[PDB]
Amino acid sequence: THHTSVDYQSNSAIVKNENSVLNVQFQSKKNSYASIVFSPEKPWDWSEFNDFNLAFELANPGTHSVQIYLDISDIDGANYTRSVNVPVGGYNTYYAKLDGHDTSGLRSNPDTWESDEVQFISMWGKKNLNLKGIAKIAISVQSTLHDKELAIKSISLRKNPQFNTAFLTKIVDEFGQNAKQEFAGKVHSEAELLSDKKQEATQLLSKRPTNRSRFGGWAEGPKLEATGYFRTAKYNDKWSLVDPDGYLYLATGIDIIRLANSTTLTGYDLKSRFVASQVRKNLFEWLPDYSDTLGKHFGYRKSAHSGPLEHGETYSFYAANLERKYGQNNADYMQKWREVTLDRMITWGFSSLGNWTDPSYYDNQKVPYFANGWIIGDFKTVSSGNGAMPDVFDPEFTVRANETVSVVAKEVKNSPWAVGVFIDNEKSFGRPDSVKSHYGIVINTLGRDAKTVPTKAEFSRLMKEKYTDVAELNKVWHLNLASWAEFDKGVTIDIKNEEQLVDFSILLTAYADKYFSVVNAAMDKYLPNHMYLGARFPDWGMPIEVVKASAKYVDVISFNAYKEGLRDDKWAFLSQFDKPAIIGEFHVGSSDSGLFHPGLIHAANQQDRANMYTDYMNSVIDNPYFIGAHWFQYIDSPITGRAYDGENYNVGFISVTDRPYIEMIEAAKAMNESMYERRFK
């Protein structure tokens, strides 16, 4: 229907008409965004159809798999983003449901009918689009390290096949696996678990090899000063860490070495137990009684979002498999899991345990670890206009900051094994997408009472410093304020004024400076010998003012970047600070895991997954500012979604049945082996 002829344009992509087939060469090596956009004469009207799907006949004659983004926009202005991986090879059909069929508490659901076809993964945006007027349909590739290609043979709208009413019925086995689907590494019997443990014990290393120091550093590199703690240095023209014995060190590893995130909502909410959600309940074949052995794995989630529950009861199939696998005959399965986990990292060559490692691990003297704290309190707050952020100028913020960091110190006990502390994570500092996005904190704060809003009170001060008289501001901001007292009370800014931006930038820096000074001070008080690794900025939300402010205080600037790699264009700005950086989170996933959601970055298969992993880690290693990266996370998200937000991604280095993804492991081992020599030699 839509193509077999339709008008289109391209953005950093050569399009050739070879037969009926659009060959798209995405110029994605050079350009961080590349696309072919399908725009008709008059905005498509699909009012006349119901219960239907948009289908693409896609091949990939390239030499890398392509994660394509499907963007469908309105005459109305709303947009929804979908994504899928197109493997190197011939044609498959990719479809997206636009109306009907599918609430379940899963970020991505099973298909609503059986096929050999591939459904796009729903990512973000406004789902319920305006079918009456569809402006554009864009296929884009974003933030790759390689040119990508796509062959489009046909685009069409199709009537959805017959609904499967049991698509959410017993999709989980008693092991937490995809019940209805076979997949690589699927456990069929409990005896497989016991058999795994025995086999794995054979291959597991105990100690670091002789080409690694005891702290996991470069035993054959230079020998810098031994401070007895992890620290930063420059060797040649590249940033490095230094281990406590003065060997060079780069941070590789895995986050969430803990069970806190491996639980899923059962649908129940002890003598007052009730089914709060029938749909949740029916997902799983097996859920034990509280009097059962494996009933030990029942938890409760106070707060839950994006699902048919705001609270309720949880179960952890991974923790259950741990008991099954390591807790034979009353054995301390937790302790055994920790010992296996430590050995795995040695064996895989990981130099550290990542963020959100369980305090259980902190007194270990085998593998280094990263510690963390969240700053929570009843202190006053500001808003990015949309996320609630700390009023960093409230004295109550320093009070809680100190207690937060103090807590961590007691966990760490001044151990050289602690590489450093993360404080907070992806705070809502603002997104530099527009004025409103960039300076939401400033804009929202400026219309609040200086008398009651400490952050605003500092804004007042700084602006008095620069402007002296309020009439002189009235010029630049193009406003008609009466007095510094009215300003102090609250100002509604002119969204379109450009001259005030220079000031907004002062105010955002000022807010950020206080944030990072407070936390830096707290670290000085409680863990003075340890590095402070920042606040883990998301690459989608890292205003330059916030980064700049952090550079004065942190030992290492942390970012999370869920991309195919660290592109030169994207990270060039780091050269203005000359500071070392770490990636707190990254991952690749694939649907061949039997999960319903590959995650944020998509590969063709486990082997592609590992190869893309290698490409990302190579980009980290070859970047002169970056000193490491941590994989998110250790364990696959539960197939029915983690209890907090329904996230059900293939993010695990191991599956729910405590089986390492083999291909990932071998990429990991390779990468860790050659990392020091690649960077420095």
Q: How far apart are CA 419 and CA 404, in angstroms?
A: 18
Please give the biggest Cα pair distance in the chain.
80
**SS (HEC) of 293-343:** HHHHHEEEECCCCCCCCCCEEEECHHHHHHHHHHCHHHCCHHHHHHHHHHH
Rounded to the nearest angstrom, the gap between the alpha carbon of residue 192 and the centroid of all alpha carbons in its chain is 32
Q: Interface with its own copies includes 209 (CB under 8 A)?
A: no
Q: Interface with its own copies includes 162 (CB under 8 A)?
A: no
- Segment near its own copies (CB under 8 A), from 24-32, 56-64, 343-351, 501-509? 56-64
- Segment near its own copies (CB under 8 A), from 197-205, 306-314, 328-336, 471-479? 197-205
Q: Shortest approach of its own copies to residue 224 CB, angstroms?
A: 23
- Segment near its own copies (CB under 8 A), from 258-266, 313-321, 421-429, 671-679? 671-679
Query: Among 89, 228, 295, 395, which residue sits at the site for its own copies (rule: CB under 8 A)?
Result: 89
Q: Shortest approach of its own copies to residue 21 CB, angstroms?
A: 5
Query: Cβ atoms within 10 A of the Cβ of 600, count?
Result: 19
Q: Interface with its own copies includes 92 (CB under 8 A)?
A: yes
Q: Interface with its own copies includes 272 (CB under 8 A)?
A: no
Query: Cβ atoms within 10 A of the Cβ of 104, count?
Result: 20
Q: Interface with its own copies includes 663 (CB under 8 A)?
A: yes
- Give bridge partners of residue 108 from the DSSP assignment: none
Q: Shortest approach of its own copies to residue 29 CB, angstroms?
A: 13
* Vertex 376 angle, CA 373 and 382, to 5°: 125
Q: How far apart are CA 660 and CA 640, in angstroms?
A: 20
Closer of 113 and 333 to its own copies (Cβ): 113
Q: Interface with its own copies includes 204 (CB under 8 A)?
A: no
Quickly list H helices, 137-260.
Answer: 190-203
- Whose tokens are 């030169």? That residue is 568
Q: How far apart are CA 417 and CA 546, in angstroms?
A: 30
Q: Shortest approach of its own copies to residue 250 CB, angstroms?
A: 16
Q: Interface with its own copies includes 154 (CB under 8 A)?
A: no
Query: Among 364, 605, 624, 645, which residue sits at the site for its own copies (rule: CB under 8 A)?
Result: 605
- Segment near its own copies (CB under 8 A), from 91-99, 249-257, 300-308, 415-423? 91-99
Q: Interface with its own copies includes 534 (CB under 8 A)?
A: no
User: Which residues does 74 contact at the CB level (< 8 Å), separation at least 6?
Assistant: 43, 129, 130, 133, 134, 135
Q: How far apart are CA 617 and CA 611, in angstroms?
A: 10
- Segment near its own copies (CB under 8 A), from 43-51, 419-427, 455-463, 669-677? 669-677
Q: How far apart are CA 320 and CA 646, in angstroms?
A: 20
Query: Among 9, 47, 103, 115, which residue sits at the site for its own copies (rule: CB under 8 A)?
Result: 115
Q: Interface with its own copies includes 191 (CB under 8 A)?
A: no
Long-range contacts of 429-434 (CB under 8 A, 24+ apart): 429/384, 429/389, 429/508, 429/512, 429/537, 429/541, 429/542, 429/543, 429/546, 430/384, 430/508, 430/541, 430/543, 430/546, 431/540, 431/541, 431/543, 432/541, 432/542, 432/543, 432/544
Q: Interface with its own copies includes 66 (CB under 8 A)?
A: no
- Segment near its own copies (CB under 8 A), from 85-93, 308-316, 459-467, 543-551? 85-93
Q: How far apart are CA 357 and CA 634, in angstroms?
A: 10
Q: How far apart are CA 307 and CA 266, in angstroms?
A: 12
Structure tokens at 286: 């097996």
- Whose tokens are 């499967």? That residue is 164
The last residues before gaps in the chain (C-N over 2.5 Å) are 4, 102, 269, 386
Query: Among 13, 36, 141, 151, which residue sits at the site for its own copies (rule: CB under 8 A)?
Result: 151
Q: Interface with its own copies includes 197 (CB under 8 A)?
A: no
- Segment near its own copies (CB under 8 A), from 7-15, 162-170, 199-207, 619-627? 199-207
Cα of first residue to Cα of last residue in the chain, in angstroms, is 57
Query: Among 2, 3, 132, 153, which residue sits at the site for its own copies (rule: CB under 8 A)?
Result: 153
Closer of 251 and 667 to its own copies (Cβ): 667
Query: Among 49, 69, 167, 183, which residue sits at the site for its own copies (rule: CB under 8 A)?
Result: 183
User: Which residues does 215 contact at the CB level (< 8 Å), separation at least 6?
Assistant: 230, 243, 244, 245, 247, 249, 368, 416, 417
Q: Interface with its own copies includes 48 (CB under 8 A)?
A: no
Q: Interface with its own copies includes 116 (CB under 8 A)?
A: yes
Closer of 151 and 392 to its own copies (Cβ): 151
Give the 3-state secondary structure of residue 275.
Answer: strand
Q: Interface with its own copies includes 604 (CB under 8 A)?
A: yes
Rounded to the nearest angstrom, the gap between the alpha carbon of residue 82 and the centroid of all alpha carbons in its chain is 17
Q: Shortest approach of its own copies to residue 88 CB, angstroms?
A: 7
Give the 3-state secondary structure of residue 544.
Answer: helix
Query: Among 6, 184, 194, 476, which residue sits at the site for its own copies (rule: CB under 8 A)?
Result: 184
Give the 3-state secondary structure of residue 350.
Answer: coil
Query: Among 41, 182, 225, 378, which residue sits at the site for its own copies (rule: CB under 8 A)?
Result: 182
Query: Among 1, 51, 61, 410, which residue sits at the site for its own copies (rule: CB under 8 A)?
Result: 61
Q: Interface with its own copies includes 303 (CB under 8 A)?
A: no
Q: Interface with its own copies includes 93 (CB under 8 A)?
A: yes
Q: Interface with its own copies includes 612 (CB under 8 A)?
A: no
Closer of 45 and 666 to its own copies (Cβ): 666
Q: Shortest approach of its own copies to residue 350 CB, angstroms?
A: 18
Q: Interface with its own copies includes 419 (CB under 8 A)?
A: no
Q: Which of the residues 9 through 38 are near its own copies (CB under 8 A)?
A: 18-19, 21
Q: Shortest approach of its own copies to residue 90 CB, angstroms?
A: 4
- Give bridge partners of residue 197 from the DSSP assignment: none
- Segment near its own copies (CB under 8 A), from 112-120, 354-362, 387-395, 559-567? 112-120
Contact 479, 414 (CB under 8 A): no
Structure tokens at 569: 């264009």
Query: Among 5, 165, 202, 492, which residue sits at the site for its own copies (rule: CB under 8 A)?
Result: 202
Query: Among 4, 29, 51, 90, which residue sits at the site for its own copies (rule: CB under 8 A)?
Result: 90
Query: Among 98, 118, 265, 620, which residue sits at the site for its own copies (rule: CB under 8 A)?
Result: 118
Percent helix / strand / coil, the chain, rounded to 5: 30, 25, 45
Q: Which of the residues 342 through 371 are near its own copies (CB under 8 A)?
A: none
Q: Shortest approach of its own copies to residue 59 CB, angstroms?
A: 6
Site residues, its own copies (CB under 8 A): 18-19, 21, 57, 59, 61, 63, 87-93, 114-118, 151, 153, 182-184, 199, 202-203, 592, 604-605, 607, 663, 666, 670, 673-674, 677
